[PDB]
Design a protein around this ligand. Sequence first.
Ligand SMILES: [Mg+2]
Length: 553
Amino acid sequence: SKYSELADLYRRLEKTTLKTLKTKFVADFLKKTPDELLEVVPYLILGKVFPDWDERELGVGEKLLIKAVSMATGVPEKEIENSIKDTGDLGESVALALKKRKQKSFFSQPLTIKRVYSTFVKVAEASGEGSQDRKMKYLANLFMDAQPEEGKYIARTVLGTMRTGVAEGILRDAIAEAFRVKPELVERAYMLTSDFGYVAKVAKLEGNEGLSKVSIQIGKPIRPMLAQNAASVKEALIEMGGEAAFEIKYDGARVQVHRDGDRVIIYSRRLENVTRSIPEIVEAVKASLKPSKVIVEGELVAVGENGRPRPFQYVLRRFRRKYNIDEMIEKIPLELNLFDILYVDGESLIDTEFVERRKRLEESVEESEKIKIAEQLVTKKVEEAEAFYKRALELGHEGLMAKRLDSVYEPGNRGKKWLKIKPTMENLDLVIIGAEWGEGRRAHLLGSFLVAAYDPDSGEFLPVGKVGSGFTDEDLVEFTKMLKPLILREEGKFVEIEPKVVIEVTYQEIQKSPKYRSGFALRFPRYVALREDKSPEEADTIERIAQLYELQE
Ligand SMILES: [Mg+2]
């Protein structure tokens, strides 16, 4: 049926600030959809054409879209750039220009969604030397048959500029409402597939039952399973109840590999299709993989000349090459460490407990130069895992993964079933404005230290946290000796100190708290090293702290 109804929806939607109603509307319109468009419609509703993991994209920029418009309109891109200069919105100018051709032009036909989809397919798929004109052809070709309403919408769709107000979750809720299926089941099904169209049609026809009967389509990418942080290895081992599987958390890029026959696709963490970027790896994988139908999860890493992993954004640039190429393979070598296998030969393993999953992984993989199986420690002993922690860290990766041996794969979910153990990275250098005496046998020494950061605006030294941890007894002695001259005042066990001494400190977290005049408060800070090479003015600054806190989410 007609793209009229689509424009109507986009209208209703724009009018309301109310998400529940946006749901109602999308929902209601879904119920009106014939099965042919059921796979097309949702993406249209999101103001897109294809899934984020589709390699197809229509190539059309604004100035390019300016042309396709003009030859429908008669209006030059001179007066169009003028026409859009008053309004502020592209599609807004495109909108009204059609009205001046609405006293004018020609010919033919309603615009129905079927047609528009078709045209978009043709536009994106078109390639090579004869490309961008054949685009603007098809587009103007569309435009002649367009109501000025429809124009604006088809236009912001093309540019990706839509502003429906409707995200993933509204659409999920909508599908649930429309077809009276179960929100948990829709969530599950989109977590496996990532195709909204497939999910829509299956809801409409095969209902709650078939949604539950939705398993992994090969080539349709799975929401990666996620992990909460732990504080520490013991925390983790005991949270998994004394025994657990341990792995490295690499500095690398999580990828997902789909092998069917010779057809091999590699999805990124964000589900970009990166397959073209890294062909070597593709060959490598085909070779390294025993079964003909598999899906495997792995962290792709950039090696560098000492064999130590490069920061993973190198992997990200490798993805970002659209162009001249085997240059990049020699420039940055990569390697692939596989930690999971969700699929073999018709067998969905997502519902299969972790250990057998690892079993299948070891079974299907023939290790190669480029393709490794991630090393795994299965242990009830802390000190082992802590040693693996220290070794991962040593080697220059991010930390340790802990994963429950009973664990099924929980796509998209952030569970306690996988956990991730890291240090915080950047340490702070702070000045000691204060301290507190020990008790008992430490009573003659200062056991707790008060740290502050510079504010070069102020000149005032602002407290950040109190650090009691990370000192040897001789550390406390040495520190007592040095802080002895500098003590400016005393009450209780508290002292007040001259801002001389700067120490390097690690913390678990930065919190915002009124308790210090800096406004921030270091959570579980710890002593790393001492700086006699620095000045109190040269110590890290509150601005740096606020920056880090804001980067903490
Ligand atoms: Mg990462």
